[PDB]
């Protein structure tokens, strides 16, 4: 029932903390069960999100409770419900047990309310489990808000209403995978819990009571409360999350500043200014490229890397032990027996690697010397040593090297040698050596980014700002999203976000759109209307009108049906802009992209690399003790598995030898793989 805290980022830890699962003790439910437990029962309302469950084998088994849901006196999930005596609705609230809720006629938030007055004769309520049109005079209770129907992890989605519950799930789990970027950034459009998430989770550092600031270090903010007291507030500089992501509190308050009780003094790993930030707002054009964004692939603008935009600080921790063998203790000295000093450089401190040293794959992170054979020396190796220099250190080079994949620059090291302080070193363990390595992971091909609606894609190509889609005025688009990944999946909400986003870019503002009660198509079209003047108005004054291109795309557009024929280009482009699309010119040719293309500000996050992304590739290596098949571990990549399903693949084809080798020369033939390598050599 207990596992590694999922602290990929603040939201993940918060969501993991408030998660429910039936898998348990034995007295309580096991795995042959589930079809009726795994379904979303009726009572699951304001009690358990329908959507927040895992995607796959575990479904309905592990679920997270809804936003306002609280376990009162003995664990029966109660949810909020305000009272409505007669045609009157109250600000009083009853945390109700799942059973007593059957007894009453409850109603939804979305019911015209003049205050205490219910406003429409036939307005919806839902008796125990069945949707029912009740009258204002039977409406005993009402629902506090849409927020209670789902979880905290789901309520953060913009216009959830427009997204298929199936895909909103992917959205909610996507966020739990959000990796803190050096450049945090709250979305151009938020739901309303971003603030509460960082605050209730414990990301940012808040001010106890009012006062002034004394000192502001990169390491501490000793504030002065007006009570005649002052406290030093350390800031976890660069600590190692269980999952590798970085947790640093960057001070947002200047020297000598009167603070408002409860205001951010420092920001959490990923918050902008007290607001959750798991990604970055980026201008996006939503069209097809030369198939670079094929099924689900995304093309990225090199311009995004120039700015340290999608860069994330990660910290890997390598460790090595000085073990006690009966052959002789494993020394940890700067003596790596067989070949060079160049390799020794960064191992500076006699043994351990010097701080601030860039370590590339293969370099020595720590040196160790163990003894050579099991019990006996070596007759052939005896002659060789004698020939060039008999006296040689007859010890093995078992030093902790950087694994294929990557290293960064050493930032911290630990060494628990003899005469330990208050530590527990295991038996046989003569002494341990930890080395923390940190690396700036820049957005690169292969990385996967995804918006809160489930558009989860991988970066296929980083384009030179030189040629990707560019707007009438110089600004280029950062990311180009394929449209074909929107019809099948049903989430028009991303297309609703991009539009409102386009307005926010020229309007220089961020908005907040609640879940079932938020922005509306008419209001959006309104803001675009204001955006048209900032985008085209400056254009009119700055000195110039419309292009051959701009007019050309208008023609093909009126023949399309996006613009009322006859109206003037000025008036035509406004119409066209209000629709959410504007004319873009192919940065490669300079010619237009026949037909208006939508563009805008969409919040896209980058997802965390699991240990699987380290591109595995294994030539020759260790082998299991009993079963003689290929096995990895520390440095030599483990072998890939060739399953029956795969076997049949080959069996289907005439691949006779290919199947033979998979069984013989590659994995199990002892004598085989041997003569195999040498033969190849």
């Amino acid at each position: 029932l207990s596992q590694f805290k999922d602290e990929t980022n603040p939201l993940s830890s918060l969501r993991h903390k408030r998660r429910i699962s039936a898998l348990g003790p034995g007295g309580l439910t096991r795995e042959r069960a589930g079809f009726d437990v795994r379904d979303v029962h009726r009572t699951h309302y304001g009690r358990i999100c329908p959507v927040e469950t895992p995607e796959g084998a575990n479904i309905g088994l592990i679920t997270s409770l809804a936003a306002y849901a609280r376990v009162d006196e003995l664990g029966f999930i109660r949810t909020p419900y305000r009272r409505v005596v007669g045609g009157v609705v109250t600000d009083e609230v009853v945390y109700m047990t799942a059973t007593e809720e059957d007894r009453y006629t409850i109603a939804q938030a979305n019911t015209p309310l003049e205050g205490n007055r219910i406003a429409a004769e036939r307005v919806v309520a839902r008796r125990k489990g069945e949707p029912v049109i009740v009258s204002p005079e039977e409406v005993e209770f009402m629902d506090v808000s849409p927020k209670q129907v789902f979880s905290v992890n789901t309520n953060l989605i913009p216009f959830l209403e427009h997204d298929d519950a199936n895909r909103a799930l992917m959205g909610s789990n996507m966020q739990t995978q959000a990796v803190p970027l050096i450049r945090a950034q709250a979305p151009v459009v938020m739901t309303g819990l971003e603030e509460r998430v960082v605050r209730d989770s414990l990301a940012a550092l808040y001010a106890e009571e009012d006062g002034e600031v004394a000192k502001v270090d990169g390491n501490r903010i000793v504030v002065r409360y007006e009570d005649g007291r002052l406290v030093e507030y350390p800031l976890r500089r660069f600590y190692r999350s269980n999952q590798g992501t970085a947790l640093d509190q960057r001070p947002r308050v200047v020297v000598g500043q009167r603070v408002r009780k409860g205001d951010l003094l420092a920001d959490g790993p990923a918050s902008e200014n007290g607001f959750l930030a798991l990604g970055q707002n980026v201008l996006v054009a939503i069209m097809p490229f030369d198939g670079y964004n094929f099924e689900d692939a995304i093309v990225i603008s090199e311009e995004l890397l120039k700015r340290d935009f999608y860069t994330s600080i990660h910290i890997e921790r390598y460790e090595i032990e000085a073990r006690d063998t009966k052959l002789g203790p494993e020394r940890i000295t700067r003596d790596i027996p067989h070949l060079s000093e160049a390799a020794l450089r960064d191992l500076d401190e006699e043994g351990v690697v010097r701080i601030g040293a860039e370590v590339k794959p293969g370099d020595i992170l720590v040196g160790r010397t163990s003894f050579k054979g099991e019990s006996e020396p070596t007759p052939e190796e005896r002659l060789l040593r004698s020939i060039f220099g008999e006296k040689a250190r007859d010890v093995k080079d078992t030093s902790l090297r950087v694994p294929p994949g990557e290293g960064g620059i050493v930032v911290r090291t630990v060494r628990l040698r003899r005469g330990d302080p208050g530590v527990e070193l295991k038996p046989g363990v003569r002494e341990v050596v930890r080395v923390y390595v940190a690396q700036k992971r820049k957005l690169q091909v292969g990385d996967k980014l995804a918006n809160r609606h489930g558009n989860k894609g991988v970066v296929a190509k980083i384009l030179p700002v030189e040629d990707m889609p560019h707007l009438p005025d110089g600004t280029p688009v950062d990311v180009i999203l394929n449209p074909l990944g929107v019809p099948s999946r049903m989430n028009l909400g991303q297309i609703l976000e991009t539009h409102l986003g386009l307005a926010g870019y020229f309007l220089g503002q961020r908005y907040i759109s609640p879940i079932f009660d938020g922005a509306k198509e008419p209001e959006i079209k309104e803001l675009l209307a204001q955006a048209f003047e900032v985008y085209f108005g400056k254009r009119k004054g700055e000195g110039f009108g419309v292009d051959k291109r701009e007019v050309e795309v208008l023609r093909r557009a009126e023949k399309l049906g996006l613009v009322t024929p006859g109206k003037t280009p000025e008036e035509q482009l406004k119409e066209l802009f209000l629709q959410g699309k504007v004319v873009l010119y192919d940065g490669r040719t300079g010619e237009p992209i026949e037909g208006p293309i939508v563009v805008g500000q969409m919040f896209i996050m980058k997802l965390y690399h699991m240990v699987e992304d380290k591109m595995h590739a294994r030539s020759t290596g260790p082998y299991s003790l009993i079963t003689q098949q290929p096995l990895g571990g520390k440095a030599q990549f483990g072998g890939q598995r060739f399953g029956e399903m795969e076997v049949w693949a080959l069996e289907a084809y005439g691949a006779a030898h290919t199947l033979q080798e998979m069984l013989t020369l590659k994995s199990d033939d002892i004598e085989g793989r041997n003569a195999a390598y040498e033969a190849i050599i």
Partner: protein, 631 residues
């Protein structure tokens, strides 16, 4: 990660990965060159990253030349689950895969990881790049139908280019007759009334205005801004005065060029329509049989390219004003709404049994729903032929009839936990807010679907195991088995509507006679289908067309069911389909090639309860995988 310009033939594999994989081959090569004195040397030379002289990459680059590698997918469902490619060493972490083959391995690029193996022996290399290469296994072991085709983005490209437009019909221009009709609607079109694309039967003024002499003449005018590609113009191709669009003419060339037998390029293409994935798929299958294998491969990327290109310019994107809602939705809703009140008053009295009410109400919505569906499309069909959304669905690209319905019209009848569907529909679309309870009502059926995938993402070898256990030994090793006991394939089917003979469907017959070996002769429409002849899909097209006239009701054809070769199956009895399209080549693992084609589609089939249904009153048959099991 998708590698757009990569050809089927190749795949981009990270140099860094290539180094480890082909290390031994590299080591040796280092010694052939001045880079390293010996192996041990060469090894230490590569033990650390910072130590590699870029001459090593040139050694690796040179080693790989010609050799190929194998790539594998998460579920290895069929033989094509593994394919061979030529490594084109590339920078970084990801593996660059060709787009066409993404159909074979079910792979999207949100994070799927593919494995890769190295055939060592000169033998393993030979089979791997000769018979296991991706370009060579183009048709599937399940259906003769092409597996590798212009799938999602390429269709879209190739479609938009070939499509004709239609605008405002005010002045009744039906020009095929007056000379004054030509002049008047030529002038009127110049004016603001008649369009360039007017329904006027013979030639809307758009054809009256421009005539293009040579082929190219047609596209230059386009480049200059006179003719949009999707516009209806007239042109003088070889021997004909063909009234066909800029785009359609261009497409004709693209193929005509991909394969230089220009006339053989026109014989197998239909420029009479927008190119759908079916017209394209068909284009490939033809190209294959007709020309040659590899030349087909050229045409494939030919399409892949222009498809990608035309695509980006067409500028199809998705805004909110795209999914158009019908104006009839409000009507069909209210009309069905008030009818719902009748059913209630009819109940409020005592006429309908508590059940009658329900079943009658669902009936109402099942129809009303279905009604707005044809409505929305009829809207796009009449008013916006070029809507980004709807187009993706009609071109073989992406979109579902039932899906569009959920955005534009409305998603309307969710079922409860158990299965007894709700009495109340979900009145909304995704365009406007799918409300809270509408959302929660909708949520139920979501889990069931998810719960169903999990029990199934479980074991994929389950079904295909059984088939490979009872079928692996089966292999083609033959001489014409001389036992001609045969099977007769039907062309007519009996009972849906009790007893009304009917021509079997189009496909079902295709799957019964395609590339089989006639047991006995057949004198059908005029032609004489000799005995033992392998019947091509074009022959399987003759027989149906003859059954249409009424000359044949069965078809004598050899098959695995009547075989004499004990542990084997012969050429004449198996038939046509190697991945290739000729006869079967002896020594083909047919047993497993069969066991697979059936283990993959099974994953699409439902999974409620194996020995299906549940004891309750009268649950009568069994659907989905549960039955295929029972069978």
């Amino acid at each position: 990660v998708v590698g757009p310009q990569l050809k089927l033939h190749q795949c981009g594999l990270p140099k860094r990965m290539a180094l480890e994989l082909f290390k031994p081959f590299l080591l040796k090569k280092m010694e052939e060159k001045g880079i390293a004195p010996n192996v041990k040397a060469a090894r230490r030379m590569l033990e650390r990253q910072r130590d590699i002289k870029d001459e090593v990459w040139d050694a690796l680059e040179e080693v790989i030349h010609g050799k190929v590698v194998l790539l594998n997918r998460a579920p290895t469902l069929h033989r094509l689950g593994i394919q061979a490619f030529q490594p084109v060493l590339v920078e970084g972490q990801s593996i660059q895969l060709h787009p066409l083959v993404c159909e074979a391995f079910n792979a999207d690029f949100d994070g799927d990881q593919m494995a890769v193996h190295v055939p060592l022996s000169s033998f393993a290399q030979a089979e791997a790049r000769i018979q296991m290469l991706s370009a060579h296994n183009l048709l599937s072991p399940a259906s003769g139908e092409p597996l590798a085709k212009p799938s999602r983005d390429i269709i879209l490209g190739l479609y938009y280019i070939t499509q004709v437009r239609k605008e405002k019909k005010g002045a009744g221009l039906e020009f095929a007759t007056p000379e004054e009709a030509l002049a008047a609607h030529e002038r009127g079109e110049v004016a603001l009334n008649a369009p360039i694309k007017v329904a006027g039967r013979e030639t809307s003024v758009g054809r009256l205005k421009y005539v293009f002499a040579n082929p190219d003449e047609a596209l230059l005018a386009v480049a200059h801004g006179i003719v949009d590609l999707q516009d209806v113009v007239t042109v003088r191709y070889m021997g004909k005065r063909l009234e066909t669009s800029p785009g359609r003419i261009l497409f004709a060339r693209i193929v005509a060029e991909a394969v230089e037998d220009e006339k053989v390029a026109w014989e197998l293409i239909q420029l009479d329509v927008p190119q759908e994935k079916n017209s394209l798929k068909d284009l490939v299958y033809q190209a294959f049989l007709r020309l040659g294998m590899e030349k087909t491969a050229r045409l494939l990327d030919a399409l892949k390219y222009y498809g990608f290109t035309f695509s980006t310019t067409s500028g199809i994107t998705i805004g909110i004003d795209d999914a158009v809602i019908p104006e009839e939705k409000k009507q069909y809703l209210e009309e069905a709404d008030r009818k719902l009140l009748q059913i209630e008053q009819a109940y409020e009295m005592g006429f309908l049994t508590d059940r009658e009410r329900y079943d009658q109400i669902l009936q109402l919505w099942t129809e009303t729903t279905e009604k707005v569906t044809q409505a929305v499309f009829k809207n796009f069909e009449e008013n916006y032929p070029f809507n980004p959304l709807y187009v993706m669905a009609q071109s073989g690209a992406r979109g579902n009839p039932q899906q569009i319905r959920q955005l534009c019209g409305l998603r309307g009848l969710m079922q409860k936990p158990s299965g007894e569907t709700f009495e109340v529909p979900v009145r909304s679309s995704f365009r406007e807010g799918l409300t809270v309870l509408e959302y929660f009502i909708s949520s139920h059926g979501a889990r069931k679907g998810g719960a169903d995938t999990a029990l199934r993402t479980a074991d994929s070898g389950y079904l295909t195991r059984k088939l490979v256990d009872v079928t692996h030994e089966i292999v083609v090793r033959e001489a014409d088995c001389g036992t001609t006991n045969y099977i007769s394939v039907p062309l007519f089917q009996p009972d849906e509507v009790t007893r009304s003979l009917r021509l079997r469907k189009r496909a079902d017959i295709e799957a019964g006679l395609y590339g089989r070996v006639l047991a006995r002769e057949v004198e059908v429409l005029g032609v004489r289908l000799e005995e033992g002849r392998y019947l091509s899909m074009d022959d399987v097209h003759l027989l149906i067309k003859a059954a249409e006239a009424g000359e044949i009701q069965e078809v004598p054809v050899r098959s695995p069911l009547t075989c004499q070769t004990r542990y084997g199956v012969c050429q004449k009895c198996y038939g046509y389909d190697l991945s290739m399209a000729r006869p079967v080549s002896i020594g083909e693992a047919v047993g497993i090639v069969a066991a697979q084609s059936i283990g993959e589609p099974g994953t699409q089939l439902t999974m409620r309860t194996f020995h299906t249904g549940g004891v309750a009153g009268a649950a009568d048959i069994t659907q989905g995988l549960p039955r295929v099991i029972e069978l």
